[PDB]
Amino acid sequence: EKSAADQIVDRGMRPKLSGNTTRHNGAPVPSENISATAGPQGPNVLNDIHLIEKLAHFNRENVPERIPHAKGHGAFGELHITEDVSEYTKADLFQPGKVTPLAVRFSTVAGEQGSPDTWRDVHGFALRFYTEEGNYDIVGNNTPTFFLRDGMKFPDFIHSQKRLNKNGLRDADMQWDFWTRAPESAHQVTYLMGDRGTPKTSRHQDGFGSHTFQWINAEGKPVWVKYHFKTRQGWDCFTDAEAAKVAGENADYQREDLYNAIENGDFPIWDVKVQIMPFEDAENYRWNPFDLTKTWSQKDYPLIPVGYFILNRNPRNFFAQIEQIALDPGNIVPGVGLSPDRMLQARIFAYADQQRYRIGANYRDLPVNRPINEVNTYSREGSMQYIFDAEGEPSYSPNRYDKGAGYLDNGTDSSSNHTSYGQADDIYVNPDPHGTDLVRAAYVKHQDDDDFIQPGILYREVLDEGEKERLADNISNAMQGISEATEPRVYDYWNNVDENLGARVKELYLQKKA
Amino acid sequence: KSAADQIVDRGMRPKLSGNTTRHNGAPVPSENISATAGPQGPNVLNDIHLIEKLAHFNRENVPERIPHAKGHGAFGELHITEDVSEYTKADLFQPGKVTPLAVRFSTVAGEQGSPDTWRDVHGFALRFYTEEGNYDIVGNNTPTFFLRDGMKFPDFIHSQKRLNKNGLRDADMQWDFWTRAPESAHQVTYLMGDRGTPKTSRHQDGFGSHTFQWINAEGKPVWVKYHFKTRQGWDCFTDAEAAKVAGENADYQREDLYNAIENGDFPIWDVKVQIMPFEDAENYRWNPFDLTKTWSQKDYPLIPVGYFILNRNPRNFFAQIEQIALDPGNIVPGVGLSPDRMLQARIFAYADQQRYRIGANYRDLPVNRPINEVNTYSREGSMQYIFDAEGEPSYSPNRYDKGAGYLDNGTDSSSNHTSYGQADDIYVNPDPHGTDLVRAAYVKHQDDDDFIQPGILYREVLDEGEKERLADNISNAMQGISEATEPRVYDYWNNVDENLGARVKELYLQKKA
Amino acid sequence: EKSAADQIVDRGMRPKLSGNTTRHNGAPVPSENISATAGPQGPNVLNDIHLIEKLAHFNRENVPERIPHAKGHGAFGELHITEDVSEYTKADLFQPGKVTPLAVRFSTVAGEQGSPDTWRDVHGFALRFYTEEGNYDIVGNNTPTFFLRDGMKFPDFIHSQKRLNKNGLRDADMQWDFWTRAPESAHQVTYLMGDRGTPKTSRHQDGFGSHTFQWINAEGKPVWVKYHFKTRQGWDCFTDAEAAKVAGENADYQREDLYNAIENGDFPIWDVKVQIMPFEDAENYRWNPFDLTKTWSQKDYPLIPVGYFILNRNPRNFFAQIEQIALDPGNIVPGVGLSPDRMLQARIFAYADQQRYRIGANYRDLPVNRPINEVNTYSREGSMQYIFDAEGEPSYSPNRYDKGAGYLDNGTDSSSNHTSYGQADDIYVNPDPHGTDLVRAAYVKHQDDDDFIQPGILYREVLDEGEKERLADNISNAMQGISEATEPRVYDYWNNVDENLGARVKELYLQKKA
Numbered sequence A, C: 001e002k003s004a005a006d007q008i009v010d011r012g013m014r015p016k017l018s019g020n021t022t023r024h025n026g027a028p029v030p031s032e033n034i035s036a037t038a039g040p041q042g043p044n045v046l047n048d049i050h051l052i053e054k055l056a057h058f059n060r061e062n063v064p065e066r067i068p069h070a071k072g073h074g075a076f077g078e079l080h081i082t083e084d085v086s087e088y089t090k091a092d093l094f095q096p097g098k099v100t101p102l103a104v105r106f107s108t109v110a111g112e113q114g115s116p117d118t119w120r121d122v123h124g125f126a127l128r129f130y131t132e133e134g135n136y137d138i139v140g141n142n143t144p145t146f147f148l149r150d151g152m153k154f155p156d157f158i159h160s161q162k163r164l165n166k167n168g169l170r171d172a173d174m175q176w177d178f179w180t181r182a183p184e185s186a187h188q189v190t191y192l193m194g195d196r197g198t199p200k201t202s203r204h205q206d207g208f209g210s211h212t213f214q215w216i217n218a219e220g221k222p223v224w225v226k227y228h229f230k231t232r233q234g235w236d237c238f239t240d241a242e243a244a245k246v247a248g249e250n251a252d253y254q255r256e257d258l259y260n261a262i263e264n265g266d267f268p269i270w271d272v273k274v275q276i277m278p279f280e281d282a283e284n285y286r287w288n289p290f291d292l293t294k295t296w297s298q299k300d301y302p303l304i305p306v307g308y309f310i311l312n313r314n315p316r317n318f319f320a321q322i323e324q325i326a327l328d329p330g331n332i333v334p335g336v337g338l339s340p341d342r343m344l345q346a347r348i349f350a351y352a353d354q355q356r357y358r359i360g361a362n363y364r365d366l367p368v369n370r371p372i373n374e375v376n377t378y379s380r381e382g383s384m385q386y387i388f389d390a391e392g393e394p395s396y397s398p399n400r401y402d403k404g405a406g407y408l409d410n411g412t413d414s415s416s417n418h419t420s421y422g423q424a425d426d427i428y429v430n431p432d433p434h435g436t437d438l439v440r441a442a443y444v445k446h447q448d449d450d451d452f453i454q455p456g457i458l459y460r461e462v463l464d465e466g467e468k469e470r471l472a473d474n475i476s477n478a479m480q481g482i483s484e485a486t487e488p489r490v491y492d493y494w495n496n497v498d499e500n501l502g503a504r505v506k507e508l509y510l511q512k513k514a
Numbered sequence B: 001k002s003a004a005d006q007i008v009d010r011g012m013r014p015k016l017s018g019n020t021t022r023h024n025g026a027p028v029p030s031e032n033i034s035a036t037a038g039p040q041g042p043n044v045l046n047d048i049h050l051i052e053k054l055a056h057f058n059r060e061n062v063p064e065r066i067p068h069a070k071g072h073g074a075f076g077e078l079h080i081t082e083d084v085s086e087y088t089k090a091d092l093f094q095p096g097k098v099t100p101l102a103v104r105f106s107t108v109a110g111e112q113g114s115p116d117t118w119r120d121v122h123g124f125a126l127r128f129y130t131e132e133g134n135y136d137i138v139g140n141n142t143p144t145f146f147l148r149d150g151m152k153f154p155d156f157i158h159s160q161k162r163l164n165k166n167g168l169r170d171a172d173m174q175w176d177f178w179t180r181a182p183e184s185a186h187q188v189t190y191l192m193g194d195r196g197t198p199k200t201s202r203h204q205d206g207f208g209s210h211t212f213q214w215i216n217a218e219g220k221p222v223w224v225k226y227h228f229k230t231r232q233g234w235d236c237f238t239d240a241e242a243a244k245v246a247g248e249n250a251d252y253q254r255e256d257l258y259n260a261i262e263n264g265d266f267p268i269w270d271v272k273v274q275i276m277p278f279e280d281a282e283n284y285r286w287n288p289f290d291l292t293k294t295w296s297q298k299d300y301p302l303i304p305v306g307y308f309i310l311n312r313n314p315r316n317f318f319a320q321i322e323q324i325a326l327d328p329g330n331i332v333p334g335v336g337l338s339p340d341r342m343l344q345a346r347i348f349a350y351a352d353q354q355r356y357r358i359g360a361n362y363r364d365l366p367v368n369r370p371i372n373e374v375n376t377y378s379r380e381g382s383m384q385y386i387f388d389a390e391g392e393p394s395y396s397p398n399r400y401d402k403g404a405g406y407l408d409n410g411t412d413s414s415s416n417h418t419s420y421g422q423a424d425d426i427y428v429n430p431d432p433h434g435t436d437l438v439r440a441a442y443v444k445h446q447d448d449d450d451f452i453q454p455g456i457l458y459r460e461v462l463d464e465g466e467k468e469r470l471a472d473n474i475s476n477a478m479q480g481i482s483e484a485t486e487p488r489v490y491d492y493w494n495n496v497d498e499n500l501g502a503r504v505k506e507l508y509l510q511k512k513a
């Protein structure tokens, strides 16, 4: 417990072993060097049991990588609460003085396993807190916003960032064809194409929940919140050229950086802060507060400190604890809720769904995925069931025994006779839906909602001249390879962000087109 | 000849003779003797055919369905003989249409080897290969069901299957669940009557059970329920007879159907609907969206649509029946859902299990492909047999011509605040009766309770022999329940009807030694 | 202006489609942009069927990558026979005048499927010929030899080339610890550390079967053979530094090169040649002829021309036709046999074993894996069974019908009554086994057999002075990061190859270390 995470990371690990190897049934292995033949020059025999066992398990080492965020790495640590936010949330892990074990995984998005850490890309920033009321995951990114506001479009974006169907090549035309035809992408593409598209390490970047979530206090009062994880190491970014150079020198530069830092006792820290928007502020804010492509201005809603987290433990086994971790924004806990962000709501479905396939039906039972409290469930069976309920316990509720049911239920019947429980605050306390029908509709339109104002503000009001110039230079690099059909779409896109940025992008682009 | 012939021939090899080949096409030396290093020497590793043959044998089994593992089916045709175009624009239901079909029949609780004639609900699952996509009506041989909320479905199904400790099915478990979930009473009464043991798949009705929606060319909705009325007529075993046949032929109904079709005795069902005007819903005496409530045929009589006939046996049972992926979520223009929470859970659940039970690309298998071309941006996944034309885009919106949704413009992401309005293709919704996410009861209609409908069946519909057999069947099914469950069951049946309840207890006590 | 492989490459491809999209049941998709909600600001509904279907299938796009050789790419083409080799083999594809469709996949070995093509590594060179007597695969490498002579050691070598269990980092100490303690590796490590460890493209390298195989003629007479695929484009290699620079600029450099070459009509060609060792020559050759770590001298066995192959077709769909191809040395055909090469014998089991898992039980039925002749098999069922036998055909043999049995069988009974078939020449005509017992034994020891003489010969008699210096430089670079425990073991390993090479390796290593 020299990290509070020691209880978690030690789960499943064998003691150190010596002497001679054994087969998987426990019988001694004769040789790891020579296989059995019928005569020295005779054929290999079928019944070299160790040989076949060794080859067959070797043949099954690989599992499907994540889509997206295949390339990643992580660590374990502790969340420490230093402020009192109890007036906003009853979430157990956020109460005063609470110390909670965590896991984190960082990643890129588009590239596969083995792809370089320092390709220009968004970086994943995904936390698990092992709380007393269950695992609470905040699966964030190193950006406060994102490319889209509807999950229907997510697989379109991700195919466009991956490889063409015909030849397995990533493609500039495809990336820009998608982005310019999905102009809601403007805010995040501006962020991505700036310095922060190439952070040097996982330690030298902020993390964000990106989405608006909900906090609910002990008396059932909700507020809207956004999470901000502010690096104590500070933002530090490569130039476009530097990142590509590092990609060739060390494709695992960030994975290695984090390992070395923790091994050397240089434990990275982030200050945990939130923006808090009162429930009553939501409808009249200048931007739609639930549109992922819109950040809340920190002038309107400043960061409020909560505490900090520290990464102080490397994994014991990378594959077992990091590759197999199943981080999921749907892992919420009491005191935390969702919001009418359609991207978030799609995510709440999508992660567990992929994980049931990528890992297996019983992925929740793996050491790194089990919570610290006992799971009380009627789920059973499935492939590779390691853990099962006490002998003879019932498989169904309501039942005549004592296993139990939901906290809203009485534990003895099916809640018939027209029983109602009321508002599902554990999902979220909803605002006005603005309609009574199943629809495919726009988000409620707020005064300053469009696809371009916020990245325009970033360019005009936040970025210094160097940042503005590198942005244009980066963009024009990224455009190399687009078709002639795509060129004017890209010019238009950037002009819509800012006419000066757009002019400079085109200027540099034509210079390089040679 | 059958309209299903083009479907059912997909994937089938020509008959082959001569000698066998390995899976790479090379000649097999022997199917009888394996290669050894000397006649009495060890088997060699590199008998390639031996290992290939053993390894593929080792991989023949796949997860059976949960539930409805034990089943069997056929192919056929739907024929429209009436004009229902005022109610629906669904292509397959338009005047004169003839549509190829598939069907799978099944029990519910038992596993792959279990008997067809255990007392159980029977599945009645149809696929129509329409010009506008596969439309599946995944029904049962009952117009109702045990529950009104999908949250409870795995509880019911575990209670119908085996105890975790010893792998035995269990009467106490079945009745403990049924009596503590009294919404079950309508279907339990149906299940425990004669129709719990139909002799064959041909001698039972089918039903969609749920309220669905039909929408016409002008966008006007009506609520509908499907009824498939058997031309062979209901014909049921007694409790004792079904149990006897269960041991004599575990595949009684599977064999019966295959034989009937081989002999040219093609079974036929008349396809009819009940149609409830959209404006009738709120004031009907029962909640029209509660699965445990039937619509009275006195209030809404059956309206004829056409008939379907089964005239084709599968070419290969595993390939075409075990691997068929029937799914109530396979709807088509002109058909919609309803605020039935059981139905809404099913719309998710089937494709979810199928992605696992069969594979991510299960839709590409011959029996699961529609007759029209699929135009999708989905790609890759295990065992991808079918892929798009070379170089076609993987994303939309794009600058090419593959296309997008019929609501979309095909060129952009529908930003700038584009709205499409009511999602009628899902269903034209009635009043939700609230503005908040809630866990709530169904809207309460005047005669809604858990017992009135099976009581009416018993008191007003069942004849004297049916009433007595019902009590006899229930008391048989009760044998083995714990003393802690007996009084709960007595009261349950009293709630249905006091005379039924009295008779059930009387017979139960007689049989209890 | 097409290809003989067009029949293969078109299997499974849809026609071009336009209009609007459909769900997977064929019904029209309402939108690819907006998901359905209960009110514009209400929750997403569960029954957006298209949303869930699109996300769920997106979630299942990935499959396990190969272990090893995850990162690869390929093409299709034609094998043309130009010489008469019928005196040596009856194999159909090798008969005079035969033109046979082919597939090829090139690859690296260690890295995962996003990793750079131009990491220093062995490159895979794996061919499939779609012959009239089945698919014949020659799954070779760009080297005539390899690191080991026993499949028992293969998973040890491959872990040592992949990532440490604790942190997911590849590791120089691990690579050299294994190589030096398994000194049979010396031949291939010398090849790997030379110029050929970094070929510029897939087109500018030779290919080899590496193992000794067997050819059998129509009369049943065997000879031992080795396959050589000599590039008409010529060897062309990066330096160690250039290869890393390219890895950062374009991780898919070689994938892109091959695609572009074929797209442009610059079809790469290799001349197909064999070495042929008479059956009577094997026991008295100066080296063991079945030891993968021993090449046959081309002074003793010159190359004999057979024909050439040309790559003239890019895949229609990369994932469907390349990622899912199941290349397998066990795919032999009449006229071709194996040998007492233990590595080869282990491979004959291992590939189909992995493919059953990596792809699925029915992987043989996928378009790219089906032969051009009809498969007549009693195998049945299994996940995703697309193809099934004619209605009512029997599932077992011997049977009273016509489907048949093996060519040695009579088609009517089980071959009891003590029926014997004799020597299994279809596997191979074996030489003497040199013993009568199941053993774990060394290979038969030939006069000049050791772990170091052949790369010593390469260094002393083949390499030019620049090649000799680059070799020492490359080695010393690859040694950076090894522990002090490993240093003297590496110094000694290189001295065993050659005292002068050894001295220069140590010299440069100590220079670079600081």
Ligand SMILES: NC(=O)C1=CN([C@@H]2O[C@H](COP(=O)(O)OP(=O)(O)OC[C@H]3O[C@@H](n4cnc5c(N)ncnc54)[C@H](OP(=O)(O)O)[C@@H]3O)[C@@H](O)[C@H]2O)C=CC1
Residues within 6 Å of the ligand: A144, A191, A194, A195, A196, A295, A296, A297, A298, A299, A453, A454, A455, A457, A458, A462, A463, A467
């Ligand atoms: N939560 C938010 O509102 C965030 C907004 N932004 C961008 O800043 C604009 C103004 O937001 P508002 O909060 O009103 O303004 P503020 O002035 O209060 O803050 C601007 C934000 O932009 C960040 N920033 C500085 N340089 C870059 C850059 N190179 N690339 C990306 N971000 C950078 C700042 O980080 P720092 O303090 O370290 O300089 C700060 O968090 C928005 O349009 C948005 O695009 C960016 C991050 C968070």
Ligand SMILES: NC(=O)C1=CN([C@@H]2O[C@H](COP(=O)(O)OP(=O)(O)OC[C@H]3O[C@@H](n4cnc5c(N)ncnc54)[C@H](OP(=O)(O)O)[C@@H]3O)[C@@H](O)[C@H]2O)C=CC1
Residues within 6 Å of the ligand: B143, B190, B193, B194, B195, B294, B295, B296, B297, B298, B452, B453, B454, B456, B457, B461, B462, B466
């Ligand atoms: N969709 C529906 O309205 C159906 C309802 N039921 C049951 O009938 C009751 C009355 O419904 P309503 O339509 O108003 O009355 P109706 O008289 O108009 O129809 C009653 C239905 O009950 C059927 N029935 C007859 N014997 C049995 C039995 N052994 N087990 C199950 N069903 C049987 C009849 O079949 P048949 O005409 O062939 O004799 C008929 O379909 C309901 O409470 C319900 O339990 C049952 C089937 C359909």
Ligand SMILES: NC(=O)C1=CN([C@@H]2O[C@H](COP(=O)(O)OP(=O)(O)OC[C@H]3O[C@@H](n4cnc5c(N)ncnc54)[C@H](OP(=O)(O)O)[C@@H]3O)[C@@H](O)[C@H]2O)C=CC1
Residues within 6 Å of the ligand: C144, C191, C194, C195, C196, C295, C296, C297, C298, C299, C453, C454, C455, C457, C458, C462, C463, C467
């Ligand atoms: N199958 C074989 O016999 C091969 C053996 N070797 C190596 O060559 C040595 C001598 O064998 P032998 O055939 O008797 O001699 P040969 O002179 O007849 O052939 C030497 C081989 O070495 C190749 N070679 C040239 N440069 C390099 C290099 N930078 N790295 C690796 N290989 C290179 C040659 O290719 P090229 O003609 O184009 O110059 C030629 O194939 C062996 O010890 C073996 O290590 C290498 C390739 C094939």
Ligand code: HEM
Residues within 6 Å of the ligand: A066, A067, A068, A069, A072, A105, A106, A107, A123, A124, A125, A126, A139, A140, A141, A146, A150, A151, A152, A154, A208, A209, A210, A211, A325, A326, A327, A342, A343, A344, A346, A347, A350, A351, A354, A355, A358, C055, C059
């Ligand atoms: C509707 C939009 C999105 C969908 C459908 C989606 C879906 C997914 C899925 C299925 C995975 C793989 C999970 C697994 O297999 O374990 C994943 C990975 C990931 N996603 Fe999302 N995503 C979306 C948008 C976002 C957003 C907005 C963020 C950040 C706020 C985000 C952050 C991440 C991170 C960090 C990972 C990697 C987690 C890890 O390291 O294991 N994604 N996404």
Ligand code: HEM
Residues within 6 Å of the ligand: B065, B066, B067, B068, B071, B104, B105, B106, B122, B123, B124, B125, B138, B139, B140, B145, B149, B150, B151, B153, B207, B208, B209, B210, B324, B325, B326, B341, B342, B343, B345, B346, B349, B350, B353, B354, B357
């Ligand atoms: C919310 C409640 C229900 C859920 C979650 C559910 C779920 C399922 C699932 C996942 C399957 C297996 C599908 C497959 O693997 O191919 C199945 C089988 C089946 N279910 Fe349902 N079911 C529900 C209620 C019903 C109802 C009400 C009916 C009839 C109206 C029904 C009829 C059937 C039939 C006929 C099959 C077998 C289809 C076949 O023959 O392949 N189920 N159920």
Ligand code: HEM
Residues within 6 Å of the ligand: A055, A059, C066, C067, C068, C069, C072, C105, C106, C107, C123, C124, C125, C126, C139, C140, C141, C146, C150, C151, C152, C154, C208, C209, C210, C211, C325, C326, C327, C342, C343, C344, C346, C347, C350, C351, C354, C355, C358
């Ligand atoms: C006993 C030693 C070896 C074993 C057990 C072994 C096993 C394997 C396996 C299981 C695969 C993945 C197959 C798949 O999933 O499709 C593979 C890939 C491959 N191996 Fe081997 N291997 C061995 C040595 C060799 C040798 C000596 C060569 C060359 C002569 C070679 C060439 C290749 C190539 C080219 C691939 C990639 C094929 C492709 O591009 O799809 N391997 N190896």
Ligand SMILES: [Cl-]
Residues within 6 Å of the ligand: A356, A357, B355, B356
């Ligand atoms: Cl799955």
